[PDB]
Amino acid sequence: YPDADGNDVSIIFSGAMSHAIFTYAQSQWNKNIIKLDDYIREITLTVPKQ
Amino acid sequence: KLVGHNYPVYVEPVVNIMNFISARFVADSSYFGYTNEIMIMPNHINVPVDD
Amino acid sequence: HALIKEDLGQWPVETGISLVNQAGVFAVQLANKLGIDKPFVLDAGSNYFT
Amino acid sequence: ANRATSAFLDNPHPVGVNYVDEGSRQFVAVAELLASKLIDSSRESDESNSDVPFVQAYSKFADDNPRHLRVKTGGKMANALTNVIRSYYSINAPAIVPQVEIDRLASKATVSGDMYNSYAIFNSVPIVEVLSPARTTVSIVGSDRADVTMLNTGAGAANITFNFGQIAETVILKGSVPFQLARLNQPMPAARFTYKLRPLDGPFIVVLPVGNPLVISATAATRIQVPLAFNKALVESGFQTAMNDGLFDIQNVNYYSSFDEFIISQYHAQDGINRVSTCVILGLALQAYDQMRRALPVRRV
Amino acid sequence: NRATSAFLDNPHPVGVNYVDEGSRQFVAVAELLASKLIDSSRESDESNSDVPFVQAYSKFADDNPRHLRVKTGGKMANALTNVIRSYYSINAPAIVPQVEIDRLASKATVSGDMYNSYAIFNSVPIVEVLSPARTTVSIVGSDRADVTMLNTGAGAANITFNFGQIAETVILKGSVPFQLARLNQPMPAARFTYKLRPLDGPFIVVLPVGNPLVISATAATRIQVPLAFNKALVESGFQTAMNDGLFDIQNVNYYSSFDEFIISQYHAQDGINRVSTCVILGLALQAYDQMRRALPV
Amino acid sequence: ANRATSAFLDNPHPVGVNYVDEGSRQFVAVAELLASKLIDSSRESDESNSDVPFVQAYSKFADDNPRHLRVKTGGKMANALTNVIRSYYSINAPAIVPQVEIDRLASKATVSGDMYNSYAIFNSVPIVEVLSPARTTVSIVGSDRADVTMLNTGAGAANITFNFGQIAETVILKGSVPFQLARLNQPMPAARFTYKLRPLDGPFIVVLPVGNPLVISATAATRIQVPLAFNKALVESGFQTAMNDGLFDIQNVNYYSSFDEFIISQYHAQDGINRVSTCVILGLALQAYDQMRRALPV
Amino acid sequence: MDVLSKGSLKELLAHLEKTPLEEAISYRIGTVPYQNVLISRNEYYNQLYPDTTSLIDGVSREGQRNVNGLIMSIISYVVSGSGHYIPNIGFMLLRRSILDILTKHDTGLVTNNLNYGIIARNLTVSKMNCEQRKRMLICFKLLAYKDGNQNDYEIYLNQNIPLKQIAPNFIPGDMRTVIHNQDQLAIVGIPAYRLTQSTELSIRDDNAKSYKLGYVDWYNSNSFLRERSEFNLIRL
């Protein structure tokens, strides 16, 4: 079923440990996935003013 | 250096994932096939079990 | 009778050696088997039948 | 005839009615999260003998890198946080920060902004009213522990009425000597040292004999909904820093010894339920103000 | 005339159940898991995902959290709440089965005991202040003792101070300098402050006729506690448990803080054995505070 | 004229002039860092079932492996930390620890001993003097919360002078009944419950009406530069432990109830500025002493 | 942001045609203007910094429900990017665009009997810069020509010589004057090189700087966020 922000959520029958490890891995990689505009803002701060 | 190393604030996700897996290996041992206690009893003693 | 079992494999543990060292070594193998060691994004929205 | 009341409960000044929407709450929560990162990065920079951890945290906080020959104060984030703290205290304080700046600053982090996740216990004891007969003298001293000293001269068995309000959850009474206390139209029990009371039970009558002054020490507990990041130690320290810097030097306002007395006094006023919501947001902002100001110390004696 | 501290009067007996090795392991396990539960909640709030909280709640409560149902805390919360009730008073029922406690204690392993550390408790015990004729003595306060004394007789009076034998050090300060010395010892010159060891014996303080003298007293007592003990958390847990009504049981005594509770039980007959139960209650209250903050109900 | 003063402000004893150099400051900061890891090692010992995290941290702290035979004391670092604390309190205490040992202990960690990179709020109320007329009686009680009780028995009202010193940043006055306080040569304000004062402005005059006693509760806040690793809760606990352990037992010294009273009393001396720097280093050492002695009690 | 970015009379008038009156007004109570306050500027001074709150600060302030309050709110929106709090304006006027309120008779609003000297004093015309002064005079001329008060507009300009020098050169009824106008009215815009992320002393200066700094980010990341809300909706 669709999430509010357009993501797809899958409900399945799966293990407690396999679900815990897989979803924790997803959350760790996700916080390092950012939009291009935010990436440009971070780059602009590093480069000189002009 | 290995012993005294301090984890940086922006630690890599691979380190966080491995710490999660290692913690679950110790905390929940029945999932991976080992336990801390066992019991040996003769057959004529009736023990309440998970039925 | 029936039951549901979660099978993550068998990982023997030696009592003399430290548990944290074995857990870390097994963590690398478990992450590789589950496919979560490298950065990834789940694509399971197309796994359905109507 | 005579009436006595706690000093900190008299005339609670109105709180600000600005910066209380969802976007402003997210801004305060972002400030607390990023101010915490500043403190940890300063500790890491000290241990690592390098400025790399501090530069990264300051750049995220202030959108600018630390500058040589220029005091680091926190940039626009510090300016916005300091002005909204002033606005929270009183209506007389102006509203200066525009809405565009807050929305820009609220997008730095991914905080929830919820203000009702958890709870906190506050120790200020409210004594709204103590009514005494003509020949009895009553004094109320203290906020964290109220000492009520009562002397009866002449006649006998003066009846003193205690009104602890309705907001406080539990109140514990301890006496120098055992005393008698019971609710209205109830029999007086045998004298005993301590009593546990629910302030909602009603006014409490205490029998005071002649001579031998009896002192009652009262401690109270009150529960207020607060965020999960709430830390009372940081809030109280931030409260003193704000008072010292002069952020609360506004006309026609009341000054308090601690944040505990501030939140309790506002709770016991009329429409106090909606005042507490603004006070909690002030507490989180003062938490951020404390961690930010300790990481960057401008004031030098 | 005799004056004594209010909080030291008639300490009620504490519970005698759930004090064995298995029960102590249950409390230590509960504190460890509750701390992880509150740490995951803060991490959960900061980030977008709620994975850390789900795993912590599942370990604590043995069921996955659900949006429709409220987060009660599971069987661990119910066991912890009733065990706290039993410790306070001997009249509180001990109903929780031991087999259920043993099962919960096996969730985690704790490498420690209840006697591997210590904590300083700043509650001043004034067992008795014996005063002569025409000498009014009032004792106010528990964390700081305010002994206000005033004499009307023509001659100076001697007042006996007994601080018990459990406190390690007691610090005395006065509004104006006063003379104090042990029994059968010469009086020193007047000083503002004194440092005393309560084992030294009853102390004699003189009172001039002129103006009232107020003596401010502080004390420090060391009690063996687990290394995970935290005085800030046990104080919050004590207040929360009192508000929740876990201590509403007949024929018991109520205290302003856990500091006064443990000291009053210490200053009683069979006080050494009572204190051990009180320390277990302290760690249980530490777990109760952390869990209730993450899961308000 | 009756003059009443706070009990804790009188006769501040001289503090030690040793172990205040850069090398010694790094030693105290190293001790705080290594004692913090020692406490955390206990929790990391519980997540597993082994004592390797504790043995690893003890060896770093004590330069020797723990042994089941003897009581874990702390090694050379424990003796150095204990003796350095004694030298801080009084100038009569010997400086037993050599500087070579301190330099060796300071190289264990890479911390920098900067003790002026943060601030702390201290709540002791300094009342230097309260001057009252003949008929009035004034009693000052307490340090954290100063309860000043004044009774007027004369025919007319009395003026009482309050001097809060020149160090405290803010002082908040709350009275049992409304009262009037104005600075010298300023018109009296109407009766209010609460007054907020800046002590530097000048002495304050309080009008005492004839009748029931008036009690004023005072709370003060003072900002003192401290290291960033300062923890007021941990410092206060260490002070009680050091007092109980007898680290402060030395002739011709003054004893205080809390580190709040100690630092404020030293600050209000004739040359109190130089004492505060030493007192802050003592607090950081006391913070390390609390963490270490709790992990290793003797 | 969008209104302050327009740099020509054509663009400003086109924007006011497409913008409803809802954007001009605000639903935040704010504070009362004309108040001597002390604000915190820790970049420069330890002491608090005095200033006076005004209607052109860029922050919503309370305003009355008369005709003057609505006009003052519109002018503040043009020159500061934020309007005032007028309680319960009504759906009938909120759907109308800003230009119709200024230059049309179908709004049901009587904008006659308006004193430009009083309005200019309330808006602190002595504190606004050349571009803000120019924008204010544009609104005045549109109001004057719609109600047939061109003489009162000229009288106001004669009394204020500094405003007469920088008066706009367009006539409201003639299209040729609008297209050939060469006024520059851009308060904010993308600058060559960059501007330091530093605070300013005044309330107006700091708020204006916050608009300039955030314009670059607003320029790049506005199309998608606005479109997500615009989709599946009917315009007012």
Side-chain angles (χ1 to χ4, degrees), chain D residues 79 82 86 92 95-96 293, chain G residues 35 38 40-42 59 61:
Chain D
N79 213 272
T82 312
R86 194 155 208 271
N92 304 289
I96 295 317
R293 264 288 153 269
Chain G
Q35 198 199 344
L38 288 152
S40 151
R41 301 286 186 225
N42 234 48
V59 163
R61 312 255 186 240

Side-chain angles (χ1 to χ4, degrees), chain F residues 104 132 135 144 164 220 266 292:
Chain F
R104 195 192 56 92
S132 90
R135 310 139 311 151
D144 55 348
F164 287 103
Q266 304 295 275
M292 154 193 88

Side-chain angles (χ1 to χ4, degrees), chain F residues 10-77:
Chain F
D10 65 9
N11 222 354
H13 63 279
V15 279
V17 293
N18 256 305
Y19 314 115
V20 286
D21 39 320
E22 209 203 335
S24 296
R25 289 190 321 247
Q26 288 197 9
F27 156 74
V28 167
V30 159
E32 201 275 305
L33 189 79
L34 293 184
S36 166
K37 274 132 179 46
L38 213 44
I39 284 268
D40 295 352
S41 64
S42 88
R43 175 67 82 212
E44 275 98 51
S45 295
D46 289 345
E47 293 177 350
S48 39
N49 192 31
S50 78
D51 294 347
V52 198
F54 176 79
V55 166
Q56 184 164 100
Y58 181 101
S59 294
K60 187 92 186 319
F61 191 82
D63 285 338
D64 181 65
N65 230 57
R67 304 261 310 271
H68 289 285
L69 274 166
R70 66 184 182 277
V71 153
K72 288 151 303 272
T73 61
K76 310 267 160 252
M77 181 95 68

